[PDB]
Amino acid sequence: IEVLAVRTGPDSITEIEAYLNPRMGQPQNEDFYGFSDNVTVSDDFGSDAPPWKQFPCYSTARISLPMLNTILMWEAISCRTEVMGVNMLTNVHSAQKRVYENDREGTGIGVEGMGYHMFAIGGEPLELQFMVFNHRATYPAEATVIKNPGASSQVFDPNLKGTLTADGVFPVEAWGPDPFKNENTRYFGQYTGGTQTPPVLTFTNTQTTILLDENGVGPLCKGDGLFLSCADIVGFFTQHNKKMSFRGLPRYFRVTLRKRVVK
Amino acid sequence: GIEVLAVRTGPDSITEIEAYLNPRMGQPQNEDFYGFSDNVTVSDDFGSDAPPWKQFPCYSTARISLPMLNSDTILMWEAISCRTEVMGVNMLTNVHSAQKRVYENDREGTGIGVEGMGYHMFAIGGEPLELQFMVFNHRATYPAEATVIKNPGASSQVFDPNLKGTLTADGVFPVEAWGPDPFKNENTRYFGQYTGGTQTPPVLTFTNTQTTILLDENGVGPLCKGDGLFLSCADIVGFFTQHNKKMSFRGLPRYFRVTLRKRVVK
Amino acid sequence: IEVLAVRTGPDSITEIEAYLNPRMGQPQNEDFYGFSDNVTVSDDFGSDAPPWKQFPCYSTARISLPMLNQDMTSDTILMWEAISCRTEVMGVNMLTNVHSAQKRVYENDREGTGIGVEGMGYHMFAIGGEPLELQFMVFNHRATYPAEATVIKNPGASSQVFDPNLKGTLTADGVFPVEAWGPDPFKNENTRYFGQYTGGTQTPPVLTFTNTQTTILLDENGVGPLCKGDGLFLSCADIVGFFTQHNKKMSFRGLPRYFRVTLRKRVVK
Amino acid sequence: GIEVLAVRTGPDSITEIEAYLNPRMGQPQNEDFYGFSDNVTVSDDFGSDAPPWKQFPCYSTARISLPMLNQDMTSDTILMWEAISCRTEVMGVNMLTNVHSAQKRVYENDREGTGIGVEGMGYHMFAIGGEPLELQFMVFNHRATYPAEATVIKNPGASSQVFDPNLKGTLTADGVFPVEAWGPDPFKNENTRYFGQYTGGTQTPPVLTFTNTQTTILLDENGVGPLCKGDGLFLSCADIVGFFTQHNKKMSFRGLPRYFRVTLRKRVVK
Amino acid sequence: GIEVLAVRTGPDSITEIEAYLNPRMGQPQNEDFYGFSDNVTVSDDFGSDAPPWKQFPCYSTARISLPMLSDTILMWEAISCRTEVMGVNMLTNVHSAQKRVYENDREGTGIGVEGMGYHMFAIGGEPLELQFMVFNHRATYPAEATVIKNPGASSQVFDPNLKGTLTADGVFPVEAWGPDPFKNENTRYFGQYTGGTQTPPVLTFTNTQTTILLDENGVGPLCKGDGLFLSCADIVGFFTQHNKKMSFRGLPRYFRVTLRKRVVK
C-alpha cells in the first residue's frame, strides 16, 4: 500500500475497547469454560490422536470501525492490552491436588506449568505458519489444520501457510505467526515451559505499545476492519486424582486509530 | 470524563499525604494471627466448594480526606506522583517461629519460612477502584461476610461484561473473586504482580528512592471527587506452613506517599 | 534544615571508606564469627523464645567527618552532604567453598560436593545524616527476644502488621534483630535505604561485585543526606543464606559490606 | 581489513533479504523425527566415549547471494552490501504447547497428567556476517571420538578442553560442525556479529519470545556493518530448545527453525 | 596517586591487545582433566578441614607487555575492553560419562554441568589487590597454594590486616581471596556469583559488548612498567560422574583492551 499523509481534523482519531475470551477447549456457558478437558497422552507418534476439547485454540475477532468510503484508511497507532482475572490464581481451595497430598493437607498447588501469552493487532487476519511437534498427530475434525502434512511440518516448510479466520478452532500447538508475512500486523509472544513452573503475570492500565513501524506507519485496516488475536494459556489445573487440563485467561484490548490518506 | 483546565500555582497549591493499609489475609485484628489467614482447607470438587471466612485474603482500601476547597469553574486535587513500599519485609528473616523444618523427619534445620505465591497490587484513584468479578470456579459458595456477585454463572470463569462492582469497603472483597476492570478506572492508576506456586521463593524489594508518576498521556493525574484520595492494595507474600503441614496466607502492610496539586475544571 | 548554596572547587569534596562486619549472632574473635548459632524452632507461637546468637541483627556505624566550622555561632554553617556512594558485599569468593563440613549433594551415599550456602538472601544498606529510623514489625508478636537484643517488649498483635506507635532508631551495632525492625518509610527524610529479600530454603545466593558502580544519593530537589553534627550513618544487613552441617543443623552466614561515600560542603541556616 | 568510504543513500541504496535455517538436531530430513536428534546414549568413561551420528546437534548455516553491484571490478572504488540491522525470530515456539504426543507424563507412576513437554538445556546462537563464521574448537572431553559424518579436529590435545590458539575452524557447511565441539572465535569475526545464550539443567523450562517489532543494529563502534565479500551474506545459528523424554525415559534434543530479516545498504570501498 | 595531564592524540597513540586466560580448576595442563578440579571431598567438621590440592580452583592472571615507552612521562591508559567466556558450546555435551537423568534405569541424557557460577575479571596497570576471606579460618590449605597462614577468626569476615596481591597464576585459591575494594584505584574489576549444586548455568556470549574502563574523571587504568594486568576466575559449575563424584569445570576467558598514550606527572 502506498501511504500518503495523516489526515487531521475533527473525528480524525477513534478508540475501540474489546476482549478475547480464551478458547482452552471446554465449551461456553458450561461449568469448565476457561479450561480444557483432562489431557490424554499417546503411547507413540504413530497412534497420536488428541481428542477435541483437550487442547487450546487461538481466540480472534474482527472489530468493525466507523464507516469511511487517494482514499482514507484507519491506521492503528498505539494499544493498551491486559490479561484480565489474574486475581483468580490466588485461589488454592477449589478441588486442587494439595501440597502434602499423602497427608491430605496444605493448600492446593494452584495453576502451574506452561505459560503461553501472545497477541496480534492488524488490518487483516493474522498470517500463520503450520508447525507441529509430531507430523503424524491426527487432529480432530472440529480443528482447522493441514491434513497429512509430512515430516517437514516438524520444522519450517514454506508450503505450509494459513490465516487466522475462525475463533477457537486453530490449535495453538499446530499454528504460529508467520514472520515471512504479517507486514500489516504487529505480534508479540512469550513462552515459558514446564509442568511445575510458577505463572508470572503483570497487569497495569498505564502501559502503551506503539504499533508504528520504522517509517512511522501502523497497521492499515482493510475493509474498515481491525483484527485482534491472542492465546493466554496460564498453566495447568491439577485435580486430586492427578488429572490435568489447561487454564487460560481473557485479554483486554484498547486500540487508538487515526485517518491515513493512501493511494 | 471531566473537562480539565489549567494547573493552579500559588501558596499551598501542593499537598502531600502519607497513609498505610494493613493487610486483610483473613484472621481478625487485635487477635494473635493478625497478618495471617486461617488454615486453608481444599474441596474435593468444584460442585461443593465453600471457602470459609478467614481462609482467604480480601482487598484493603481507605478514602483519605484532602483539605476542603471551594462557578463555571471549580478546583479539584490532582494526584501527580506517588511512592509506595511493602513494609516489614524484614520479618521474613524469621525461621524459628513454629514452622515446618527443612528436615522435619529428623526434627532439624531452620523453619522453611514464607514460600509460595506473591500477589502485590496497589491503586491510587480519585474514586473507588472499579472491579471486574472473575473466579477460578463459579460454583464456589463464598461466606456471608464477603462481598461477591451471587449465582455468577459459568461466564464468570472468564470475562463477562455484566459482572462489575466497586471496591467500596475494606477487608471484604475476595482477592480471588475481583480484579481491576481495565474497561473503566480512567480516574485510577493500578499496578499488579502475580507469581504462582506454593514452594516458590518470595522476592520483595524496598527503598525510599523510587517515585511513580501518575500523569496520563495528556499529563492529567487522578482528580479527587468530593476531596477524596482512594488507596487500594493486596500484598499476599506467601504461605506459612505449621509443623503438621497446615498452610495459611501471610500478608504485609503497604505505605503510600501521594503528592497532589490544585487543577481547574468545569 | 534551611539548605542554601553548594560549595564548588577542589577543597569542597571528601571521600570516606568504611566497612561493616555482619552480626549473624556468634561473637567476634571466636571460631564461628560470620555465623549464627544453629537455629532451633519453636513448637508454637506462644512458647517461642529465640535464644541469643541464633538470629542476625543490623550492623551500624557513625563515621566522624572533618569538622568544617571553626565557629558555630555564625548565621550560616558548612554541613557535609552525601551526593554519591559505592557499596560492595565483600567475601563473595568464600562461597566457592563446597568442602568445609557441609551436608553433601548425595549424603545417603556420603558423596558429591558440599551443598554450599543456600537459602534466604537479605541484603539492605542505609546512608544517612542521622540514625536509620526503624518501624518495629515481627512475624509472631508472642516471641520473647533475649535480654541481649533491643526490641519493643510485649508489643501486641498489631506488631504483626503496621502499628504507628511502634517506632525506633538503629542506635547500636549487633543488637537490633533483622526479624523485628525494618526501615520506616514515614521517616528517613535524611536517609537513603535500599533492600531486597529472596527467601526459599533451597534458593541459591545471587551476588555481584564491582568497583565501577556509583549510586547517586540526591533527592528530587538535588539535596543529599545532610550529616548532622558531622556524623555519617552507615547501616546494613547481608544474610547470604544458611550453612547446613552433616547432622542437618543450620546457621545463618553473613558477609561484610564496603562503603565509599562522596560528600561536598553545603551552606545551611 | 577493507578501507571503507562513504554510504550511498536514497531508495535504491537499500535491500532486504528474508531467510530461514532449519535445525540440524541429528535425525535426517524427510523422515519421522526431523527436528529431533536420535535417543541420546551416555559413555561409561572419557576413554571409550564415542557419540553415534544422529545423537548430537550441529550448527546451521547458509550463504545468501546478494545482487551483484559492480559492472567493472578493476575500478579505484567499488560498492559492497553493508548489513546495518536484522530481525531474527525462533519459529514454531507454538508447537511447545503440545503435551499429548507420547511424553513421560508428570505422574508416570499413575499413568496420569500431561506430558512434561520439552524440558532442559537451551542453546540459542545466531551470527550474521559478510564471510563464514570463524570457530574455536573446544570440547568437554578431548577423547570423544566423533563419527566420520561430523567435521571436528581429530586427536585434539587435552589443550582442546580449554583454549588452544592452534585449534581454529570456519563454519563452511550446514549440519556437520557439532555445537558441542565448535564455538564462535572472539580472536576473529571482525566481519560478523554473533549472539548466544546457554541455559543448562535437565528440568529447566524453556523461555522463548517472538515478535516482528524487535530490531538488532549490526553497526560497529565506527558505524560499520558486516561487509559482504563476493556479495555473500552468511547466516549461522543453533536453536536447541530442550529434550523430548519418551515413556521409556529415552531423551532426544528438540530443535526449532530460525527466521532472519537483514537490511543492507550500499557502501563504497577500496 | 599519579597526577594525569593530557591525552597525546597523534599517530600510533592508540594500541590494542587480545589475550586469553585458561582456567585453573585444579587438574594439571597436558593431562586428560585439564579444565576440571579433581573429585571434591568434604570435611566432617571445621577443625579437621584440609582441601587436598587440585580439588579447588585458583585465580588466573597474566601481565601483557605493551609497546615500550623528564618532568612529564607518557603512560599507556586502558580506555575500553571486551571480554567473552569461550567454549560455552561445550556445555551442550550430555554424552561424556556423567550421571544420567534416570541413573536407576540407566537411561536419559547426562545431567550435564550444574551448580554454581563464579565469573570475575579485573583489568589494571598493576597486580589485582586482594582481601583474604575464608568460609572457615581453620581450613589447612596445601603447600602449593598461596594463602595467609593461621589467619585467625576475623578472616571469616573483614580484617583490615589480611591483604594480598595476585602475583601468580593458578595458586591463589578463589575461596580464600577476593578483590579488595579499599584499593584497586588503578584496576577495574567485575564479579557475579550464583551458588548451589543443581543450579541451571546461565552464560551469554557476543562480540558486540564494550565495557568503558574510565573513572568519573575520564581516566583509565595507567599501565606501570608498560604492563597490562589481566585476572579472572570462570567456574561454570560441577561435573557429576555415574558414581556421584563431583568436580569443578571452568572455561577460558577472552580479553580485548584498547589503550591510549597519557601524559602523567
Query: Partners for D (CB, 8 Å, 3+ pairs)?
Result: A, E
Q: Tell whether A214 is in a known binding site.
A: no
Q: What share of chain B is helix, strand, coil (3-state, %, to 5)?
A: 5, 40, 55
**Measured between beta carbons, which residues in chain B are less than 8 angstroms from residue A111?**
196
Method: X-ray
Q: Where is chain D broken, named by the residue before each break, C–N > 2.5 Å?
A: none
Q: Contact C174/C59 with Cβ under 8 angstroms?
A: yes
Rounded-to-10 torsion of CA C116, C117, C120, C121: -130
In whole angstroms, give the CA distance from residue D18 to residue E240: 43
What is the grid cell recorded at E175?
575461596
**Backbone dihedral angles phi then psi of residue D109, each to the nearest 5 degrees:** -55, -35
Backbone torsions φ then ψ of A235, nearest 5 degrees: 160, -160
User: What is the nearest CA distance from E115 to chain D, expressed in angstroms?
Assistant: 9
The CATH code of domain A13-263 reads 2.60.175.10
Residue A83: how many CB atoms within 10 A of its CB? 24
With touching defined as 3 or more inter-chain CB pairs under 8 Å, the answer for chains C and D is no
Interchain pair E82, D186: CB under 8 A: yes
Which of A37, A92, A208 to mutate to test binding with chain B, by most B CBs within 10 Å of its CB?
Answer: A92
| Residue of A245, A255, A248, A259 lying closest to A86 (CA atoms) | A248
Report yes or no: C134 and C167 within 8 Å, Cβ to Cβ.
yes
Strand partners, B254: B21, B86
Note whether B touches C: 3 CB pairs or more under 8 A.
yes
Q: Which cell is A148 given?
A: 497429512
**CA E96 to mean position of chain CA atoms:** 26
**CA gap B61, B128 in Å, rounded:** 9
C93 interfacial to chain E (CB closer than 8 Å): yes
Q: How many Å apart are CA E149 and CA E153, to the nearest integer?
A: 12
Residue E139's CB: how many other CB atoms inside 10 A? 23
Are E86 and D183 in contact (CB < 8 Å)?
Answer: yes
How far, CA to CA in Å, does A237 sit from each of A109, A244, A246, B123, B218? 9, 6, 6, 29, 42
- Where residue A101 falls (left for φ over 0; alpha for ψ -120 to 50; beta otherwise) is alpha
Q: How far apart are CA A71 and CA A77, in angstroms?
A: 18
What single letter denotes the amino acid at residue C56? P
**Cα–Cα nearest to D159, from E173, E29, A248:** E29
Partners of A215 on chain D (C-beta within 8 Å) are none
Touching subunits for chain E (3+ Cβ pairs under 8 A) = C, D
**Cβ(D87)–Cβ(D215) under 8 Å?**
yes
Could you tell me the CA-to-CA distances from A73 to A183, A211, C21 in Å, in that order?
Answer: 16, 15, 67
- Other CB atoms within a 10 A radius of the CB of residue D72 amount to 6
| Inter-chain residue contact C101 with E154, CB threshold 8 Å | no
The C-alpha atoms of residue D256 and residue D260 are separated, in whole angstroms, by: 13
Tell me, yes or no, if E86 comes closer than 8 A to chain D by beta carbon: yes
Q: Are A39 and A245 in contact (CB under 8 A)?
A: yes
The alpha helices in chain D, defined as continuous H runs, are none
* Residue A101 annotated as lining a ligand binding site: no
Q: Does A101 reach chain B within 8 Å, measured CB to CB? A: no
Where residue D172 falls (left for φ over 0; alpha for ψ -120 to 50; beta otherwise) is alpha
Summarize chain C as % helix, strand, coil (round to 5): 5, 40, 55
Q: In this structure, what C-alpha cell is assigned to residue B195?
A: 507469581
A82 marked among binding-site residues: no
Pick from A32, A80, A88, A206 the residue to mutate for testing the B interface (most B CBs within 10 Å): A88
Rounded Cα distance between E43 and E47, Å, is: 9
Q: Which CATH number fits domain E14-265: 3.40.50.300, 1.10.510.10, 2.60.175.10, 3.90.1570.10?
A: 2.60.175.10
Reduced to 3 states (helix: H, G, I; strand: E, B; else coil), residue D260 is strand
Strand pairing partners for B205? C196
- Residue D201 and residue E196: Cα distance in Å, rounded? 13
Q: Round to whole Å and give the CA distance between C52 and C36.
A: 9
Residue B177 CA to residue B174 CA, distance in Å, equals: 5
Q: Classify domain C13-269 by CATH architecture.
A: Sandwich (2.60)
Distance from CA of E11 to the nearest CA of C (A): 30
User: Is residue B45 within 8 angstroms of chain A, CB to CB?
Assistant: yes
Give the Cα-Cα-Cα angle C206, C211, C212 (nearest 5 degrees): 100
Q: Taking CA atoms, what residue in D is nearest to E234?
A: D162
Q: Please name the residues in contact with E252: beta carbons below 8 A apart, sequence gap of 6 or more.
A: D138, D162, D163, E20, E21, E22, E23, E85, E86, E87, E234
Residue A251 near residue A83 (C-beta atoms within 8 A): yes
- Do strands A175-177 and D112-115 pair parallel, antiparallel, or not at all (unpaired)? unpaired
Chain D CB within 8 Å of residue E34 CB: yes
CATH for B14-266? 2.60.175.10
Asked if A21 and A83 touch (Cβ cutoff 8 Å), the reply is: no
Tracing cell 514472520 back to the chain, one arrives at A179
* Closest in D101, D103, D209 to A189, CB measured: D209
Provide the resolution (angstroms): 2.5
User: For the structural domain made of D14-270, what CATH number should be given?
Assistant: 2.60.175.10
Q: Indicate the Cα dihedral angle A95, A99, A100, A105, nearest 10°.
A: -50
Which of chain D's residues have a Cβ under 8 Å away from the Cβ of E95?
A: 40-43, 49, 51, 55-56, 144
Instruction: Compute the distance between CA of residue A175 and CA of residue C240 in angstroms, rounded to an integer.
Output: 46
Which residue does chain C place closest to B203, by CA atoms? C198
Residue partners of B226: CB distance under 8 A and separation at least 6: none
Which residues does residue E4 pair with via DSSP β-bridges, in sequence order?
E264
Contacts of E107 in chain D (CB under 8 A): 248-251
Residues 139-158 of E with CB under 8 A from C: 139, 153-154, 156-158
CA pair distance A126, A60, nearest whole angstrom: 9
Give C106's contacts (C-beta < 8 A, 6+ positions apart).
C112, E244
Give the separation between CA B151 and CA D232, rounded to whole angstroms.
67
* Cβ <8 Å between E193 and C92: yes
C-alpha cell at E168: 601468580
DSSP annotation of D202 reads S
Q: Do A173 and D36 touch (CB under 8 A)?
A: no
| Candidates A31, A91, A100; nearest CB to B139 | A31
C178 closest CA partner among B35, B206, B94, B112? B94
